[PDB]
Amino acid sequence: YKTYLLDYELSLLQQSYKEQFITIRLNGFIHSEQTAINGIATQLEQQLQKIHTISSGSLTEVFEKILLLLDITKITVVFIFDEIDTFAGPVRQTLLYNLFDMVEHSRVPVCIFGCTTKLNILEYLEKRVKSRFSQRVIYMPQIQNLDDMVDAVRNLLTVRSEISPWVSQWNETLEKELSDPRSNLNRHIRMNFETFRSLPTLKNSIIPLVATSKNFGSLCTAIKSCSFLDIYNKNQLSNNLTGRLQSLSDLELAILISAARVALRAKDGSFNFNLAYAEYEKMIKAINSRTIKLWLKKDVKNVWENLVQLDFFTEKSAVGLRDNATAAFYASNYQFQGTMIPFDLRSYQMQIILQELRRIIPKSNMYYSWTQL
Amino acid sequence: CISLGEPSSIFQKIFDSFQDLNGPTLQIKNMQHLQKFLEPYTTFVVVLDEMDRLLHAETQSVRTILELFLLAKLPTVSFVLIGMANSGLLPQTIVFQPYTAEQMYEIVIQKMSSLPTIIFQPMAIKFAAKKCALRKLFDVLRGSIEIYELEKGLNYIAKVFSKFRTRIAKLNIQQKLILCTIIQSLKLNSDATIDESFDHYIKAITKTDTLAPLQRNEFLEICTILETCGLVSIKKTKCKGKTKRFVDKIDVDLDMREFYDEMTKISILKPFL
Amino acid sequence: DQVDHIIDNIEADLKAEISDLLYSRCFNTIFLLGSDSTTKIELKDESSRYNVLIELTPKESPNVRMMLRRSMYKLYSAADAEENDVSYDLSLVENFKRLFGKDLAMVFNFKDVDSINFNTLDNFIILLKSAFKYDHVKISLIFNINTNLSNIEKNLRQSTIRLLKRNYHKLDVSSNKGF
Amino acid sequence: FLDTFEGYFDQRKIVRTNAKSRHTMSMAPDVTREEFSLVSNFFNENFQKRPRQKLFEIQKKMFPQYWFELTQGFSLLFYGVGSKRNFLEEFAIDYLSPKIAYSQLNSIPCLILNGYNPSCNYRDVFKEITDLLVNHVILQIQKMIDFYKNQPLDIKLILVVHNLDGPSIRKNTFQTMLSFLSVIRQIAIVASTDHIYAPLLWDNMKAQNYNFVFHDISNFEPSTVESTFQDVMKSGAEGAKYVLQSLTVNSKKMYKLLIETQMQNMQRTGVELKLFNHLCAADFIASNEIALRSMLREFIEHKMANITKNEIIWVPYTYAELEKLLKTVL
Amino acid sequence: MNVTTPEVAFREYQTNCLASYISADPDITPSNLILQGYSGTGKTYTLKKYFNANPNLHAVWLEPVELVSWKPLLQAIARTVQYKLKTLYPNIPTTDYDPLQVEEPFLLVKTLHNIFVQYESLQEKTCLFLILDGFDSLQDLDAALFNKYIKLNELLPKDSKINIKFIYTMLETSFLQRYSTHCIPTVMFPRYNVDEVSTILVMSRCGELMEDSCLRKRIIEEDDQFQNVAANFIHLIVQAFHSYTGNDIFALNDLIDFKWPKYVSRITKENIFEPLALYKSAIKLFLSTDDNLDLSIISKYLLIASYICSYLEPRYDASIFSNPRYLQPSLFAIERLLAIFQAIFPIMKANIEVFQNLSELHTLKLIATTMNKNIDYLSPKVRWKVNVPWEIIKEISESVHFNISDYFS
Amino acid sequence: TLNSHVITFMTRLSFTAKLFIYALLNLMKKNGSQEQELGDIVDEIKLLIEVNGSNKFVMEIAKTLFQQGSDNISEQLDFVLNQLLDAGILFKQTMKNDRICCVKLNISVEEAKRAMNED
Numbered sequence A: 001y002k003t004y005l006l007d008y009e010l011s012l013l014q015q016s017y018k019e020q021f022i023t024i025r026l027n028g029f030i031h032s033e034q035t036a037i038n039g040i041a042t043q044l045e046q047q048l049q050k051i052h053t054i055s056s057g058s059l060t061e062v063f064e065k066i067l068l069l070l071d072i073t074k075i076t077v078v079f080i081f082d083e084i085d086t087f088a089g090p091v092r093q094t095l096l097y098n099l100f101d102m103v104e105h106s107r108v109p110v111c112i113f114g115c116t117t118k119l120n121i122l123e124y125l126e127k128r129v130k131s132r133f134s135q136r137v138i139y140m141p142q143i144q145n146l147d148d149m150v151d152a153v154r155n156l157l158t159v160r161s162e163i164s165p166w167v168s169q170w171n172e173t174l175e176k177e178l179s180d181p182r183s184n185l186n187r188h189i190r191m192n193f194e195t196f197r198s199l200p201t202l203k204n205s206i207i208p209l210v211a212t213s214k215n216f217g218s219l220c221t222a223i224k225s226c227s228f229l230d231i232y233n234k235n236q237l238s239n240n241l242t243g244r245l246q247s248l249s250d251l252e253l254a255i256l257i258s259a260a261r262v263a264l265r266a267k268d269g270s271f272n273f274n275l276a277y278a279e280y281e282k283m284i285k286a287i288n289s290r291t292i293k294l295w296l297k298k299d300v301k302n303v304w305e306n307l308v309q310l311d312f313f314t315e316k317s318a319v320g321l322r323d324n325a326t327a328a329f330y331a332s333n334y335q336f337q338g339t340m341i342p343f344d345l346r347s348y349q350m351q352i353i354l355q356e357l358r359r360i361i362p363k364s365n366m367y368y369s370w371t372q373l
Numbered sequence B: 001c002i003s004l005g006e007p008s009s010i011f012q013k014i015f016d017s018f019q020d021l022n023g024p025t026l027q028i029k030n031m032q033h034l035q036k037f038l039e040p041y042t043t044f045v046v047v048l049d050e051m052d053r054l055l056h057a058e059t060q061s062v063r064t065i066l067e068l069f070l071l072a073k074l075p076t077v078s079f080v081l082i083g084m085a086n087s088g089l090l091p092q093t094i095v096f097q098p099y100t101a102e103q104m105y106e107i108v109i110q111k112m113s114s115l116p117t118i119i120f121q122p123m124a125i126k127f128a129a130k131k132c133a134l135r136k137l138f139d140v141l142r143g144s145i146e147i148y149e150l151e152k153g154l155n156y157i158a159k160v161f162s163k164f165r166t167r168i169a170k171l172n173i174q175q176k177l178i179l180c181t182i183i184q185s186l187k188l189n190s191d192a193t194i195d196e197s198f199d200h201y202i203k204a205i206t207k208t209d210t211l212a213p214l215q216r217n218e219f220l221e222i223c224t225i226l227e228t229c230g231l232v233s234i235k236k237t238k239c240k241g242k243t244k245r246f247v248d249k250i251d252v253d254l255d256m257r258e259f260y261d262e263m264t265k266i267s268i269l270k271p272f273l
Numbered sequence C: 001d002q003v004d005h006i007i008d009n010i011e012a013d014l015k016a017e018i019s020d021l022l023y024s025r026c027f028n029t030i031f032l033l034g035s036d037s038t039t040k041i042e043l044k045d046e047s048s049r050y051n052v053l054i055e056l057t058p059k060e061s062p063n064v065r066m067m068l069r070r071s072m073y074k075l076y077s078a079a080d081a082e083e084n085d086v087s088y089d090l091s092l093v094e095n096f097k098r099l100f101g102k103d104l105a106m107v108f109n110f111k112d113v114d115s116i117n118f119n120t121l122d123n124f125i126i127l128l129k130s131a132f133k134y135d136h137v138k139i140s141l142i143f144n145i146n147t148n149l150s151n152i153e154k155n156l157r158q159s160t161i162r163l164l165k166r167n168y169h170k171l172d173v174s175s176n177k178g179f
Numbered sequence D: 001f002l003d004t005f006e007g008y009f010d011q012r013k014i015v016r017t018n019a020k021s022r023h024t025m026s027m028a029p030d031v032t033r034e035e036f037s038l039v040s041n042f043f044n045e046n047f048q049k050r051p052r053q054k055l056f057e058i059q060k061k062m063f064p065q066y067w068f069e070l071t072q073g074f075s076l077l078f079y080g081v082g083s084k085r086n087f088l089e090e091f092a093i094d095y096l097s098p099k100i101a102y103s104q105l106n107s108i109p110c111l112i113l114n115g116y117n118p119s120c121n122y123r124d125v126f127k128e129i130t131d132l133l134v135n136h137v138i139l140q141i142q143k144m145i146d147f148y149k150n151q152p153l154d155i156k157l158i159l160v161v162h163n164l165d166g167p168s169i170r171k172n173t174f175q176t177m178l179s180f181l182s183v184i185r186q187i188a189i190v191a192s193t194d195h196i197y198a199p200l201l202w203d204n205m206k207a208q209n210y211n212f213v214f215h216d217i218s219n220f221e222p223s224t225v226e227s228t229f230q231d232v233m234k235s236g237a238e239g240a241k242y243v244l245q246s247l248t249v250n251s252k253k254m255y256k257l258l259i260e261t262q263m264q265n266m267q268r269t270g271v272e273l274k275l276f277n278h279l280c281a282a283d284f285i286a287s288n289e290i291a292l293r294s295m296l297r298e299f300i301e302h303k304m305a306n307i308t309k310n311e312i313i314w315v316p317y318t319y320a321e322l323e324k325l326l327k328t329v330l
Numbered sequence E: 001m002n003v004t005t006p007e008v009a010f011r012e013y014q015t016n017c018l019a020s021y022i023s024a025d026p027d028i029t030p031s032n033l034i035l036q037g038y039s040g041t042g043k044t045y046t047l048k049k050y051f052n053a054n055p056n057l058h059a060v061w062l063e064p065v066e067l068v069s070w071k072p073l074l075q076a077i078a079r080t081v082q083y084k085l086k087t088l089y090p091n092i093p094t095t096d097y098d099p100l101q102v103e104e105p106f107l108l109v110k111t112l113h114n115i116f117v118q119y120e121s122l123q124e125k126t127c128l129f130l131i132l133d134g135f136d137s138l139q140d141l142d143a144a145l146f147n148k149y150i151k152l153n154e155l156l157p158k159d160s161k162i163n164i165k166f167i168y169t170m171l172e173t174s175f176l177q178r179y180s181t182h183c184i185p186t187v188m189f190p191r192y193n194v195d196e197v198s199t200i201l202v203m204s205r206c207g208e209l210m211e212d213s214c215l216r217k218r219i220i221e222e223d224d225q226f227q228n229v230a231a232n233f234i235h236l237i238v239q240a241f242h243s244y245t246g247n248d249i250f251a252l253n254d255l256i257d258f259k260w261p262k263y264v265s266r267i268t269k270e271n272i273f274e275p276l277a278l279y280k281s282a283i284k285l286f287l288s289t290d291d292n293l294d295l296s297i298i299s300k301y302l303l304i305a306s307y308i309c310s311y312l313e314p315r316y317d318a319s320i321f322s323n324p325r326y327l328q329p330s331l332f333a334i335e336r337l338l339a340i341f342q343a344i345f346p347i348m349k350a351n352i353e354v355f356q357n358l359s360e361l362h363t364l365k366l367i368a369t370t371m372n373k374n375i376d377y378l379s380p381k382v383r384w385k386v387n388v389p390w391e392i393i394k395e396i397s398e399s400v401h402f403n404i405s406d407y408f409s
Numbered sequence F: 001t002l003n004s005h006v007i008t009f010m011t012r013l014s015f016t017a018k019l020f021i022y023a024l025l026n027l028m029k030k031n032g033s034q035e036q037e038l039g040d041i042v043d044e045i046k047l048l049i050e051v052n053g054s055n056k057f058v059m060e061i062a063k064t065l066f067q068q069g070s071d072n073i074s075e076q077l078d079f080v081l082n083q084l085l086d087a088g089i090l091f092k093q094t095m096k097n098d099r100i101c102c103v104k105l106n107i108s109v110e111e112a113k114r115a116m117n118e119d
């Protein structure tokens, strides 16, 4: 609740003092180093014409006009900076040095409200950038006890206005389930308090629970038994490593089991298609000796490529998704060694060890005897 | 050469400094466009200052110097090249000897010969000429005039060399305790970081039970004083173990002779050294 | 005089055999086993249908973005020379009927398949598969394989082999095909 | 075994550590750059000058035979022991140009390519071909192959590529550029290979377009032109004398005491960190103890006093040539 | 919330979740909606039928997979938004902007702000859904690309008559977990089982199989009867390829078309009413997948010597000529290859013919090296290695009558 | 300003976030490498749950952390992982695998153990 508190303060002041300040919003992910200069001049020409050019020319002439403007009453230039940790680079903080200079030396009232996620934001600044700062770091409070989450949910589902005849009946049902700790609403709140402890996270399930109700009778039923809440929790954990194993056939499970035994008995866990086919072939002849159709080597290629797309076999010493866009361009122009070698000699890694496969497989399956080693 | 934009465009500047502005201004690309202009002509003398910056910071680096050397070696033309670098067709190398004590003293009297009265002493210029062994001598003599005129000889030359153990006495007793633990962690662990130096300083002051400890957030404030004065150098390197990640390492740059002599005079700290 | 007549006769039967298999919601893959990418493919001039032959080289194909930009430049240049600036992407293929009025029949000729990277060629086939929902665009790929049909199969994904197998034919034309 | 495949596995035995030698470049006599060229130019013009001139006259009789192969579309590729720079410039100009211009009735222009120079780009070579004949480079040659097919057979441009084994020619971008031009029956290709892996560069698709003809002409040339492109003389004996000459008077005294102390017992490990401070106590040279870092950071930049703390320093330099340095600084 | 919820097969929970978020009122519509789900889960089918039954919602479809780089993605957003708003309200005179001027993430905010200012003449707030079918399928993908799109609504003016709505359809799972702290209502899509896959293919392929040209020409040479025939072939294909394909829809749809003409021609006047005799007559269409649809003498021997130098140590080579195959091959030298090649060659010096076959061996990608683009064969630091599997090198040595399995035994 | 909000931040976290920090510190006292992979933290968390599985007091939390109190939800093997990364406390290298990905601590080790004992 960082941007939500800042948006409420701007709306409260706009209902009385709408001609005394402007709104200048900035982002750390969208605006880069060079685009941050043009973003300030662009938001200034559109806000000055609304109360009663700047962003004209090259990049050098734009920054020159900004310093000549910021550096009966005045106009407060409220600066809303989002994700300020990206601009606090250890190489140079040009924008952070000029923004803080518009507070102490400059006479124009400039209110900078930075929003970041790093707890140690004081060390990310330079020696001169931190000198111009007032060291005003307001930490956002979190949920401590259990009664803090109950009062927040009650205030989000209580209609304090006479806009529907079912308002008086809905407030009695919500207050009855919340005051009783043995109800179903208090159980889901306590479960999310020790697992997530986030208000927007728990709000993702209350919204579809009310919209799916057809009438008032269906709303009071779903709010008392919480039947729809259990379905939402199962869907969120249906496409992970556990839900993907139940959607596999008999051959897709035999390949992943045989490939797990090779990486487990090895030293570094390296294996390829040739090592996985040797364990699968020795398992079919061992079971039938005590009829499973043994597939040829030309048919396992389609099953091997299907498990890679399903996030199960990761390449050995592979970075994968890059952080920023700089490392993503250099990695695309360089041809990796795994693309030149054939598919039967590519070193892969298992995303799940054999110890975890024995717990998510029931005893009714016939492939349970080959998961102990 | 340093007052240019590109090192490859050095042939165009010579054309603008020789050809008249009333005639047609031609464009010069390289050697083929500059040699044909000096064919009909008149001794063209050029002074290329600081030729060491003409390289492209071995095959492609030595290109502008090798091209300009070949232009002033072939006959049929008349183009001389005199460069002033900084320390069978090879140029005549002349090493400029530095000025000594007797060489710097003659230039002072020769430069100030136009002045009617000389307020300098013959024994004061002899000390500044030997201690500076020409640009360094000018800053010494100029500093003595500004100092003497701000407070209102032989002692005037000694004050310019002293006004421009001291860094330790300018610190507090609390900053000396952390500094003593910084060099101590670098002796029993060689490469150490800021996180490892803070743990060694806390465990070293707990056995003595003197002075209150400080948090990790305020630990960087003391190290910042040593970096501004010139006693602790903090750089950014990597690790050498299994987790070779980017981390901030701490280092020093002081002598061990002066360190084991200033803190021992207070006679209040012994196990911290 | 007889050698030059034989060389001219080699390309004569090669241009007739390729055109006989090119025009007689899938890709028309034609594998040219034993081709050094030195044959000039000439398409027919049928009415109400514009045919464009796009030749892709491994040197001019460094990535996927440059593969689509170079293919759209030759398409817009060939259609304008027969009979307003547009972007060089897949939007030109979709808006080909609204800007010209005739059908589209792109014939891709991948020169030197063994010298190109397989990680880039796989993404180009999947990107061109979305042009089948236009009901007026037909893409025909031509590969000049110089090794074997088994070496070019292991370097592709399962979604690429099954897609091109809907209408793929073999046409071995080496330097000594049957002596 | 010495020859055949048996000689490869017999001459690569596992040599023991104690059986190896420790002879470096310290015992070898040091030479300068002025005396290196005077002797080289003397041995390349007098030693075996008569057998080299007599052998060159024998290969000169093959000049009409080389021209007969270029008229039929067969490109020439000379090889052997030594360089072929003097053999190509004397044949492709003083014999190939007058004979061609007098058989198809100015002279025929010849484009000499410097393959030994690493700075031979592929965009500057094609610029002279278009201006004399009248990837955009590869697409331009393909448009001229079919255009020159209907033209009559008449040699108009001679390509004399020198050294077909340098770093610039061995690149795959430049090779295919020259093979496509060799298919033209109106352009003569005269190359010369020196590396032993010459046929490894071209394959079956490149040999048919090149149509090269091998001609062994081992003239045993010392190769004086291509030898001036690499660092043949390749920590600086003559370079260290110019550093001390530009320094001050007090700077030369600091290096004189370090050399005399290090060269006293070459088995002294060198000069310790605190050992250098003891020399200042007997000779007023430096200021105090904190001034040692001002002179230590300057000597290590010119490569003259390497550090090797197990602070004991030791510069990798023998005492054979170090004794002569004390006489110059004195 | 006034909207119509369509009826989707085996997607009762997924269809109800879309109606709880997507609405015509921006006050009860979230700014972000991720539709995570792997291939063959029905993400596009549950979205097209949801927007076709409700014509009051204006959604913009965009395929990021057709733009490769991220630069054309920013240009396609402003181009499709202006084109959609032009045909929606033709009685409003707006200014056409150049979509090619969007090259930076900041320029996208300025371009979208210059369009929403001329659409304030409306009465109620009209949503603008921007469906991004396949966000993670983009080529140049990074971890900072999704962070620039989830904060686009913050820079937009709150007092606007048209609010943008971003809809992402992810495919993998790890890409979604990287932004789990943003609290985005994600609608997962689980894969179908063996009972839902066959039921989907029946209700989607029966309308095109019984009216095909091959089946109509077979009954005249030899509508309720043709329905059970086409339904039996679909059920027999899934049960015979459930292990080869798994649960993918594209993998099973290709096998049906590849075996449909071969299954119609095997139907006579007696196999129309007896399904037992029809399965036995075409037993070759269910037991296998039917797959999918000249080397020189010196070139054959060069690949044999290259396989030995890449899978054996060179320290013991003076004892034979005078499982390591399961790992990556090793790099050797040119002179080390010609020594073994000359020993295994039957009764030859190294002439230009040997180097000619070796240069052609690298063109077909049969032997790898240390450099891919711009390789130097004359460089002494560039090594050579084999690039063929064991099954390929086994059939080559068998044609020349050479024992290649005894060297590794 | 001189106060440190890192200590009080970990004391107000949920049980899932506090268990990930306690599991990371326990792995450092066994091997001493300052580089624990992601696969070792998952195995160490499950090892602490099965310590007293026969007791009714410990099995009450196993049904929520692995099944969320539902019989239809299978036994699980991401919210608390990305939360500590943006707070400047935990670090994670760029790796496509979720088992061999090393996890390093950015804050001090002395101030991290004080928050676990306060709970």
Ligand SMILES: Nc1ncnc2c1ncn2[C@@H]1O[C@H](COP(=O)(O)OP(=O)(O)OP(=O)(O)O)[C@@H](O)[C@H]1O
Binding pocket: E008, E009, E010, E011, E037, E038, E039, E040, E041, E042, E043, E044, E045, E171, E200, E203, E204, E249
């Ligand atoms: N529940 C269903 N009932 C009937 N047909 C379905 C169902 N789900 C999917 N389909 C069919 O599956 C076909 C192919 O699936 P489609 O490509 O649309 O799925 P997707 O999950 O959106 O794909 P992708 O991951 O490639 O984006 C569609 O044409 C659709 O008709």
Ligand SMILES: [Mg+2]
Binding pocket: A002, A003, A082, A115
């Ligand atoms: Mg925010």
Ligand SMILES: [Mg+2]
Binding pocket: E043, E044, E133
């Ligand atoms: Mg889809």
